Each structure stands twice: as structure tokens, then as C-alpha cells.
Amino acid sequence: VLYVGSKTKEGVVHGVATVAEKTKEQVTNVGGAVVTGVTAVAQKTVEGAGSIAAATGFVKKDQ
Amino acid sequence: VLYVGSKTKEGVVHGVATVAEKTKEQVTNVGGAVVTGVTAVAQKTVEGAGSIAAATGFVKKDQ
Amino acid sequence: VLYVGSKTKEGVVHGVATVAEKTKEQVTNVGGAVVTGVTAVAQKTVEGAGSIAAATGFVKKDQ
Amino acid sequence: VLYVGSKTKEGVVHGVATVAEKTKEQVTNVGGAVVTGVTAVAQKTVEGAGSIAAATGFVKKDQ
Amino acid sequence: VLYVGSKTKEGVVHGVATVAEKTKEQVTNVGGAVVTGVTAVAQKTVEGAGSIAAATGFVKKDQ
Amino acid sequence: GVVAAAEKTKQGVAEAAGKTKEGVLYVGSKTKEGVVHGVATVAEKTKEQVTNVGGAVVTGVTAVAQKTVEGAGSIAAATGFVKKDQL
Amino acid sequence: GVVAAAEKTKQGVAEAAGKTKEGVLYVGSKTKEGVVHGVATVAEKTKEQVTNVGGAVVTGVTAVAQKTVEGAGSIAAATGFVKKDQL
Amino acid sequence: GVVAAAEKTKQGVAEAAGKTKEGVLYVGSKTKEGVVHGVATVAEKTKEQVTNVGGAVVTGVTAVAQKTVEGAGSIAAATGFVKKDQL
Amino acid sequence: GVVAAAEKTKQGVAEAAGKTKEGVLYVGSKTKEGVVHGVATVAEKTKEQVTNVGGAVVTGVTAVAQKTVEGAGSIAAATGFVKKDQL
Amino acid sequence: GVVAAAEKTKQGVAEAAGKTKEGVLYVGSKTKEGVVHGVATVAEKTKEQVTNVGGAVVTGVTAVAQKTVEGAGSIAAATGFVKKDQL
């Protein structure tokens, strides 16, 4: 009937950082999945069932 | 009837940081799933059943 | 009936940064999926079921 | 009936940065997928069921 | 009936940047995909089911 | 004088002088070298009498901003300076 | 004079002078070096009488901002300086 | 003078001079290097009489901000300095 | 003068001068080097008379801010200094 | 003068000058070296007046901030210093 929404956050990601210095890394992958970086996922769904927000670094071989 | 919502957050991720310095790393996987970068996921669903927010860094081989 | 929404955010990603200095990296993958960069995904759906927002770094060989 | 929406943001990404200095990198992949850059994806969907926002660093060989 | 929308954002990407200095890079790919650049995708769809916004950096060999 | 108003309507949105910095703003460097900034002086019931005989008299504020002053035996900034040197 | 108003409406929304810094704002360096900032002076019930005979008189404040001054035997900043040197 | 108002409304949202810093704000370095900041002086009931005979007089505040000064036998900052050296 | 108001409403949301920092704020370094900050002086009932005969007089505050001074036999900062060296 | 109010309301939310620091704030280093901060002086109904004969007089306070001073036989900071050395 009477709604006031001010500065409301729903499904929000903010303030994600990564700092590296003098860093060395080696990756040798064969048929797999390697994730080293940053993933920032924000999701807001209405009337949506079975919703996946993030799916990172999997190796799926279902039947 | 009479709702006021100010600065309300629902399903919010904030303030995620990683700091690395003089770090060496070596990854060698074969058919697997390696994750070294953390993920920030925020999810809000309305009338959504069976919702997954994060599915990071595994291996699924269901039959 | 009477709605005022001011500075409201739904499914928003903001403020994602990575800083690197004197960093070296080697990647050698064969048939795989290696992710090192930044992914920032924000999603809002209305009446959308089974919606994925991010699917980074996958290797999928389902049957 | 009476809606006022001021500076409301839905499915919005802003403020994504990457800073690198004195950084060397080597990638040698065959049949694979290597992602080292920045992907910033924002998606809003109305009455759309089963929508993917981002699919990065993928290797899919379904049958 | 009475809608006022002032400075509203839906499916908007802005403020994405990368800064590189004294950076050298080497890529040698055979039959694969390598992404090192910036992708900024903003999508807003109405009455569209099954919409993908970004499909960066993959290799798909479905049968 | 900035005024934004909305009276006697069913809906009103008023925005005064608002500033937004959305986007990418890049500055390589923003140095400032040898800068004098913001000098203010206030006096009340002002009355001045100056009598000078062979000298130098300056009334007011002094503000000197220099980046590089080269040379040996030089004077960069002087206020009320008397120099009587033999050689 | 910044004013934002919304009266006699069913729904009124008003923002005064508001600042947002959304996005990416990159600054490589923000150095300041040799800077004089914010010098204020207030004098109430003030009158001045100056009598000078062969000298130097300055009435007020002094602000000197330098970055680099090189050279042997050099004076960089001097207020009320008397120099009587043999050589 | 910053004002935001919403009167005689069913719903009113007033925002004054607000500041937001969402997003990425990167600064490589923010050095300060030889800086004089915020000097204030207030004087009430001040009458000035100056008599000078061959000297140097300065009446006020002194502020000197320098970064780099080289030189053998050099003076960087001097206030009320008298130099009488034989040679 | 910052005011945010909402009178005679059914729902009022007043927000005065508020600051938020909800992002990534990166600073590599924030050094300050040789800095004079915040000098204040208040004087009531001061009626100054100055008589100078061949000297140096300064009437006020002295603030010197330096980073680097090189040199053998050099003077970096001096207030009320008298130098009479034989050679 | 910061004011936020919501009166004659069935529902009121007033917010004064508030600060939020959510997110990631990163600082590599926050050094300060050779810094003078917060010097104050108040004088009420004091009694003084200056007469000088060939000397050096400074009236007030002194604040010197230096990071590094190098050199042999040098003087970094000197207040009321008298230097009469035969050579």
C-alpha cells in the first residue's frame, strides 16, 4: 500500500579485491579445470526456480 | 500497509580481499579441479526452490 | 499502490579489482580450461526459471 | 498505481579494474581454453526462462 | 498508471579498465582459444527465453 | 543560486547540482611543485602612515612560488632583505 | 545557495548536491612537494605607523614554496635578513 | 547553503549533500614532501608602530615549504637572521 | 548549512550529509615527509611597538617544512640566528 | 550545521552525518616522518614591546619539520642561536 525503499541491496556483491606482489605460479593441466582469478557473481531472480548463481572450476561428466 | 526500508541488504557479500606476497605456487592436476582464487557470490531468489548459490571447484561424475 | 524506490540495487556487482606487481606465470594445459582473469557477472531475471549467471572455468563432457 | 524510481539499478556491473606492472606471462595450450583478461557481464531479463549471463573459459564436448 | 523513472539502469556495464606497464606476454595455442583482452557485455531482453549475454573464450565440439 | 522544484503535482522529482563520476577517469600523474595556495588577510579600522628615507617599504602579503632556482651564490626568495657585502 | 524541493505532491523525491564516485578512478601518482597551503591572518582594531631610514620594511605575512634550490653559498628563503659579510 | 525538502506529501525522500565512493579508486602513491599547511593567526586590539634605522623588519607570519636544497655553505630557511662573517 | 527535511508526510526519509566507501579503495603508499600542519595563535590586548637599529625583527609565527638539505657547513632552518664567524 | 528531521510523520527516518567504511580499503604504507602537527598558543592581556640594537628578534612560535639533513659541520634547526666561532 505504502512502500519506501531507500538504498536497499538485494543480491549485491561489492568490494572484492586481490593484491599480489613478487608472486610466481606454474599450472600444468590435462583434461581438468584450474581457476586462479577472481569471480564476483551477484544474482537476483523473481519467480525462478532452480537458479544457480555461480558454477566455477568443475569438471562434469554425468550420464 | 506501511513499510519503510532504509539501507537494508539481503543476500549481499562485501569486504572480500586476498593479499599475497613473495608466494610461489605449483599446480599439476590431471582430470581434476583445482581452485586457488576465492569467489564472492551473493544470491537472492523469490519463489525459487532448489537454488544453489555457489558450486565452486569440485568434480561430479554421476550416473 | 504507492512505491518510492531510491538508489535500490538488485543483482549488482561493483568494486572488483586485482593488482599485480613483479608477477610471472606459466600455463600449459591440454584439453582443459584454465582461468586467470577477472569475471564480474551481475544478473537480474523476472519470471525466469533455471537461470545461470556464471559458468566460469568448466570442462563438461556429459552424455 | 504510483511508482517513482530514482537511480535504481538492476543487473548492473560497474567499477571493475585490473592493474599489472612488471608482469610476464606465458600460455601454451592445445585443444584447451585459456582466459587471462577481464570479462564484465551485466544482464537483465524479463519473462525469459533459462537465461545464462556469462560462460567463460569453457570446453564442452557433450554427446 | 503513474510511473516516473529517473536515471534508472538495467543491464548496464560502465567503468571497466585495465592498466598494464612493463608487461610482456607470450601465447602459442593450437586448436584452442586464448583471451587476454577486455570484454564488457550489457544485455537487456524482453519476452526472450534462453538468452546468453557473453560466451567468451571457449571450445565447443558437441556431437 | 541553484534551485530545482516540483510543486502541486501527483509526482515530483527534484535534483539539485549533483555530480557523478561514472566511467573510467585515468590520470598518469598529478604533481604540483613549488605552489603557494590560499593566503588570506583581514584588517579592521584601517589606517596607514608610511614615511621612507632611502629605503624600501612594501605593504601587503608576499607569496613566492618557484620550481627550480639555479646558480651559486643566488637568492631565491627574500622579504625585507638588506645586503651590504664587500668583495 | 543549493535548494531542491518537492511540496504538495503525492510522492516527492529531492536530492541536494550529492556526489557519487562510481566506476574506475585511477591515479598513477599524486605527489605534492614544496607547497604552502592555507595561511590566514585576522587583525581587529588595527592601525599602522611605519618610519624607515635606509632599511627594508614589509608589513604582512610571507609564504615561500620552492621545490629545488641548488648552488653553493645560496640563500633559499629569508625574511628579515641582514647580510654584512667581508670577502 | 544546501537544502533538500519534501513537505505536505504522502511519501517524501530528502537527501542532503551526500558522498558515495563505490567502485574502484586506485592511487599509486600520494606523497607529501616539504609542505606547510594550515597556519592561522588572530589578533585583537593591535596597534602597530615600527621604527627602523638601517635594519630589516617584517610584521606578520612566515611560512616556508621546500623539498630539495643543495649547496655548501648555503642557507635554506632564515627568519630574523644576521650574518656578519669576515673573509 | 546542510539540511534535509520531510514534514507533514505519511512516510518521511531524511538523509543528511552522509559518506559511504563501499568499493575498492587502493593506495600504494601515503607518505608525508617534512610537513608542518595546523599552527594557530590567538592574541588579545597586544599593542606592539618595534624599534630596530641595524637588526632584524620579525613579528609572527614561523613554520618551515623541508625534505632534504645537502651541503657542508649549511644551515637548514634558523629563527633568531646571529652568525659572526672569523676566517 | 548538519540537520536531518522528519516530523508530523506516521513513519520517520532521520539520519545525521554518518560514515560507512564497508568494502576493501588497502594501503601499502602510511608513513609520516619529520612532521610537526597541532601547535597552538593563546595570549590574553600580556605585556610586551620590542626594542632591538643590532640583534635578531622573532616574536611568536616556531615549528620546523625536516625529513633528512646531510652534510658535515651543518646546522639543521636553530632557534635563538648565536654562532661566534673563530677559525
Closest Cα in chain I, distance from residue B53 (Å): 22
CA distance J34 to I36: 9
* Contact flag B4-I22 (C-beta cutoff 8 Å): no
CA distance B51 to A53: 8
Comparing C-alpha atoms, which of B29, A60, E50 is closest to residue D61? Answer: A60
- Cell 628563503 locates to G77
Cβ count within 10 A of residue I37: 23
Q: Mention every residue, 6+ apart, whose C-beta is less than 8 A from residue F14.
A: F4, F5, F6, G4, G5, G6, G12, G13, G14, G15, H4
Chain F contact for H4 (CB, 8 A cutoff): yes
Q: Which amino acid is at A55?
A: A
What does DSSP assign to residue H53?
E
The beta-carbon neighbor of I8 closest among J8, J34, J77 is J8
* Contact flag J26-A19 (C-beta cutoff 8 Å): yes
* Contact flag B48-A53 (C-beta cutoff 8 Å): no
Chain J positions in Cβ-Cβ contact with residue C15 (cut-off 8 Å): 23-24
Q: Which residue of A has its CA nearest to J12?
A: A4
CA distance J38 to I54: 35
* Contact flag H13-C2 (C-beta cutoff 8 Å): no
Q: Mention every residue, 6+ apart, whose C-beta is less than 8 A from residue H20.
A: G18, G19, G20, G21, G22, I19, I20, I22
CA distance C50 to A47: 10
Q: Which three cell numbers stand for residue G78?
A: 629569508
- Count CA atoms within 13 Å of residue E13 on its CB side: 26
Q: Which three cell numbers stand for residue G25?
A: 578512478
* Contact flag B43-A42 (C-beta cutoff 8 Å): yes
Q: Which chains touch H (3 or more CB pairs under 8 A)?
A: A, C, D, F, G, I, J
Asked how this structure was determined, the answer is: cryo-EM
Q: Which three cell numbers stand for residue F50?
A: 608610511
Q: Which residues pair with F55 in a beta bridge?
A: none
CA distance I3 to A21: 46
* Contact flag D45-E24 (C-beta cutoff 8 Å): no
Our CA dihedral for G3, G7, G10, G14, rounded to 10 degrees, sits at 10
Residues placed in the known binding site of E for Cu cation = 14
- Count CA atoms within 13 Å of residue G56 on its CB side: 18
Chain D positions in Cβ-Cβ contact with residue I23 (cut-off 8 Å): 15
Tell me the count of C-J CB pairs closer than 8 A.
Answer: 3
CA distance F26 to J48: 56
Comparing C-alpha atoms, which of E60, H79, J14, D37 is closest to residue C35? Answer: D37
Q: Which residues pair with J37 in a beta bridge?
A: I37
CA distance I65 to I59: 19
F and E touching (3 or more beta-carbon pairs closer than 8 Å): yes
Q: Which three cell numbers stand for residue C26?
A: 606459466
CA distance I64 to H80: 13
Spatial contact of J43 and I46, defined as CB atoms under 8 Å apart: yes
Chain A contact for D10 (CB, 8 A cutoff): yes
* Contact flag G39-F38 (C-beta cutoff 8 Å): yes
Of the residues A45, A62, A63, the best mutation for testing chain B's interface (the one with the most B CB atoms within 10 Å of its CB) is A45
Chain H positions in Cβ-Cβ contact with residue C16 (cut-off 8 Å): 24
* Contact flag A18-C14 (C-beta cutoff 8 Å): no
Comparing C-alpha atoms, which of B24, C17, A3, D53 is closest to residue I24? Answer: C17
CA distance F59 to H1: 35
Closest Cα in chain G, distance from residue E29 (Å): 32
CA distance H49 to G48: 6
Chain I contact for C20 (CB, 8 A cutoff): no
- Cell 597552538 locates to J40
- On the 0-12 / 13-18 / 19+ scale of CB atoms within 10 A, A43 is buried
* Contact flag F67-G64 (C-beta cutoff 8 Å): no
Chain F positions in Cβ-Cβ contact with residue H58 (cut-off 8 Å): 79-80
H-run or E-run covering J79: strand J75-79
Q: What is the resolution of this structure in A?
A: 2.5
Q: Which three cell numbers stand for residue A63?
A: 550420464
Q: Which three cell numbers stand for residue C5?
A: 524506490
* Contact flag H56-G59 (C-beta cutoff 8 Å): no
- Count CA atoms within 13 Å of residue F47 on its CB side: 9
What does DSSP assign to residue E54?
B
Spatial contact of I80 and J56, defined as CB atoms under 8 Å apart: yes
* Contact flag G44-H46 (C-beta cutoff 8 Å): yes
Using left for φ > 0, alpha for ψ between -120 and 50, and beta otherwise, residue J76 falls in alpha
Spatial contact of I84 and H84, defined as CB atoms under 8 Å apart: yes
Q: Which chains touch C (3 or more CB pairs under 8 A)?
A: A, B, D, E, G, H, I, J
Distance (Å) of CA G58 to CA F20, G53, H65: 47, 14, 20
Chain G positions in Cβ-Cβ contact with residue D14 (cut-off 8 Å): 22-23
Cβ count within 10 A of residue F41: 16
Chain A positions in Cβ-Cβ contact with residue D11 (cut-off 8 Å): 44
- Count CA atoms within 13 Å of residue H50 on its CB side: 33
Cβ count within 10 A of residue F59: 13
Closest Cα in chain G, distance from residue C44 (Å): 20
What are the extents of the domains in chain H?
1-87
Q: In chain F, what is the greatest distance between 2 CA atoms, to the nearest angstrom?
A: 88
CA distance F81 to C24: 59
Distance (Å) of CA G77 to CA E13, F5, F63: 53, 54, 12
Q: Which three cell numbers stand for residue F31?
A: 604533481
Considering only residues 35 to 54 of chain F, which have any Cβ-Cβ distance to chain H shorter than 8 Å? none
Under CATH, to which class is G1-87 assigned?
Answer: mainly alpha
Is B52 known to sit in a ligand binding site?
no
